Design a protein around this ligand. Structure first.
Ligand SMILES: CCNC(=O)C[C@@H]1N=C(c2ccc(Cl)cc2)c2cc(OC)ccc2-n2c(C)nnc21
Ligand SMILES: CCNC(=O)C[C@@H]1N=C(c2ccc(Cl)cc2)c2cc(OC)ccc2-n2c(C)nnc21
Lengths: 114, 107
């Protein structure tokens, strides 16, 4: 489905996060081979990334904005769970997630199909 | 604002009474829990009691600020705890409700 909220998530939230200077670790799935992380998929059971979310938004995969919001959350949470407290990527996720929250606070209030 | 009233009366109320909410209703007490490293690792402690008090005292200027506090609370939990800890699942569950409810926040 296309809805007002999903349109906003795509054209405002994803637009802003994708081009952010801290977006680059999150633009594609975590590549455990490239990164040398033999435990990544043992710890993180539902990988998510902004490449997947953006493709889902482009292909009308979502029925409601809440589903898309959960994917963003999962991506950020995975990052916090997997990494150490002092890792830079935590600070990068935090910066992106605050923008995510700021924009979500101003999303159209009642979901309706376009 | 109307949004803050919603975060207080709808969002917070739904989260607060949840069966997984008990760890999050008051600040982490690092002495009582025996966590001498808690405040070394977590630089901005946050909890729903603090947020609730802030909502009740007109501390917030925008809904977004309140939402950031909720996020800080959840994030602190994921950062401090082990991936396999039950509290991580509890936080994840509450965080999903938060986002679900926030999605219907009035404009
Ligand atoms: C022990 C080393 N740890 C890692 O590599 C974890 C990895 N850590 C990073 C990462 C990101 C930034 C820095 Cl400065 C260092 C590491 C990472 C880098 C990527 O490059 C394209 C993609 C996903 C990543 N990511 C995400 C997202 N979640 N965990 C990680
Ligand atoms: C090694 C022990 N670790 C801890 O005690 C961390 C602590 N862990 C818990 C906790 C919560 C639930 C369970 Cl099942 C086990 C531990 C905790 C329990 C509380 O009881 C009133 C309050 C805050 C908590 N919390 C929050 C919030 N973030 N980290 C923790």
């Amino acid at each position: 489905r296309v809805t007002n909220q999903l349109q906003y998530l795509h054209k405002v939230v994803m637009k802003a996060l994708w081009k952010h200077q801290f977006a680059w670790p999150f633009r594609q799935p975590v590549d455990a081979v490239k990164l040398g992380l033999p435990d990544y998929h043992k710890i993180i059971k539902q990988p998510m990334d902004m490449g997947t979310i953006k493709r889902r938004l482009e292909n009308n995969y979502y029925w409601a904005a809440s589903e898309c919001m959960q994917d963003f959350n999962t991506m950020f949470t995975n990052c916090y769970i997997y990494n150490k407290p002092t890792d830079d990527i935590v600070l990068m996720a935090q910066t992106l997630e605050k923008i995510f929250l700021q924009k979500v606070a101003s999303m159209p209030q009642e979901e309706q199909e376009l």
